[PDB]
Chains A and B, each alone.
Chain A
Amino acid sequence: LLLQTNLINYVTSIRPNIFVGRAEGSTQYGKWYFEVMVDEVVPFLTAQATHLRVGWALTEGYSPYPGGGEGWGGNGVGDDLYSYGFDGLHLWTGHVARPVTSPGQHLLAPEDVVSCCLDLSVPSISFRINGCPVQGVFEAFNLDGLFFPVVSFSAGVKVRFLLGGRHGEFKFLPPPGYAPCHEAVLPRERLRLEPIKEYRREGPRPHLVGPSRCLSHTDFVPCPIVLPPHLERIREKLAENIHELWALTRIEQGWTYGPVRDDNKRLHPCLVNFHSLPEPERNYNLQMSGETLKTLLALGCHVGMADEKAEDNLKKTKLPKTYMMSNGYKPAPLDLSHVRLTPAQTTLVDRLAENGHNVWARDRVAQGWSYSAVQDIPARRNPRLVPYRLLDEATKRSNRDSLCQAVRTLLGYGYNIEPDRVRIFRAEKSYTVQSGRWYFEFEAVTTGEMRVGWARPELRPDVELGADELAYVFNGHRGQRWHLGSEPFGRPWQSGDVVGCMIDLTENTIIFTLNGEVLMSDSGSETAFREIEIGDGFLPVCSLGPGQVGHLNLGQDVSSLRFFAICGLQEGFEPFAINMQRPVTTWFSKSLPQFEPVPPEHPHYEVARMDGTVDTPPCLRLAHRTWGSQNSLVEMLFLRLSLPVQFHQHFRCDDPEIILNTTTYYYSVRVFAGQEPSCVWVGWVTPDYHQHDMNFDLSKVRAVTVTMGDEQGNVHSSLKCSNCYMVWGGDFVISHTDLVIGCLVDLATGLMTFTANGKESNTFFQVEPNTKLFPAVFVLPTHQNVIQFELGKQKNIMPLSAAMFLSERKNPAPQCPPRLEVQMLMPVSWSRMPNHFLQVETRRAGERLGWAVQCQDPLTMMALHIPEENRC
Chain B
Amino acid sequence: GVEIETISPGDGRTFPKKGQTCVVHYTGMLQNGKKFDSSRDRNKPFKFRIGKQEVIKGFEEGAAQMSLGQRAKLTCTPDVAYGATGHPGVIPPNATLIFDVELLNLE
Residues of A within 8 A of B (CB): 4, 6-7, 43-44, 47, 72, 89, 99, 104-107, 109, 649, 770
Contact = CB atoms under 8 A, between A and B. Distances in A.
A46 B66 CA distance: 24
Contacts of A43: 8, 71
Q: Which 9 pairs between the two chains have the least Cβ-Cβ distance?
A: A47-B40, A47-B41, A106-B9, A649-B31, A106-B8, A107-B8, A47-B38, A107-B7, A6-B35
Contacts of A109: 8-9
16 contacts: A4-B34, A6-B35, A43-B8, A44-B40, A47-B27, A89-B7, A105-B6, A106-B7, A106-B8, A109-B8, A649-B31, A649-B32, A649-B96, A770-B31, A770-B32, A770-B33
B5 interface: yes
A6 B38 CA distance: 11
A770 B6 CA distance: 22
Interface string B1-39: 000011111000000000000000001000111110010
A43 B25 CA distance: 13
A104 B41 CA distance: 30
A99 B96 contact: no
A355 B105 CA distance: 72
Interface of B: 5-9, 27, 31-35, 38, 40-41, 71, 96
A104 B8 CA distance: 10
Given A7-B41, A43-B8, A47-B27, 18 more contacts: A4-B34, A6-B35, A43-B71, A47-B38, A47-B40, A47-B41, A99-B5, A105-B6, A106-B6, A106-B9, A109-B8, A109-B9, A649-B31, A649-B32, A649-B96, A770-B31, A770-B32, A770-B33
A43 B42 CA distance: 18
A21 B32 CA distance: 37
B40 to A, nearest CB: 4
A235 B32 CA distance: 76
B98 to A, nearest CB: 12
Contacts of A770: 31-33
Contacts of A106: 6-9
Nearest to A4: B34
Instruction: Identify whether the interface residues of A are mostly helix, strand, loop, or mixed.
Output: loop
Contacts of B5: 99
A396 to B, nearest CB: 54
B29 to A, nearest CB: 11
A6 B33 CA distance: 12
A720 B8 CA distance: 29
Nearest to A71: B33
Contacts of B32: 649, 770
A47 B40 CA distance: 5
Nearest to A649: B31
Contacts of A99: 5
A104 B71 CA distance: 14
A107 B5 CA distance: 12
Contacts of B34: 4
A104 B12 CA distance: 14
A47 to B, nearest CB: 4
A7 B9 CA distance: 27
A43 B104 CA distance: 13
Nearest to A6: B35
Contacts of B9: 104, 106, 109
A388 B33 CA distance: 51
A104 B34 CA distance: 29
Contacts of A105: 6
Nearest to A769: B31
Contacts of A47: 27, 38, 40-41
Central interface residue in B6, B7, B27, B31, by most chain A CB within 10 Å: B7
Contacts of B8: 43, 106-107, 109
A280 B34 CA distance: 76
Contacts of B33: 72, 770
A94 to B, nearest CB: 14
Nearest to B35: A6
A99 B72 CA distance: 13
B25 to A, nearest CB: 8
Nearest to B5: A99
Contacts of B6: 105-106
A107 B7 CA distance: 6
A47 B41 CA distance: 6
Contacts of B27: 47
A71 to B, nearest CB: 8
A47 B45 CA distance: 12
Contacts of A44: 40
Contacts of A104: 9
B38 to A, nearest CB: 6
A7 B27 CA distance: 14
A810 B8 CA distance: 46
B105 to A, nearest CB: 15
Contacts of A72: 33
A558 B56 CA distance: 62
Nearest to A7: B41
Nearest to A870: B33
Contacts of B7: 89, 106-107
A843 B35 CA distance: 38
A6 B40 CA distance: 13
A99 B98 CA distance: 15
A47 B5 CA distance: 21
B56 to A, nearest CB: 20
Nearest to A865: B34
A770 B33 CA distance: 10
B27 to A, nearest CB: 8
A89 B72 CA distance: 12
B26 to A, nearest CB: 12
Nearest to A87: B7
A100 to B, nearest CB: 11
B67 to A, nearest CB: 13
Nearest to A72: B33
A99 B33 CA distance: 15
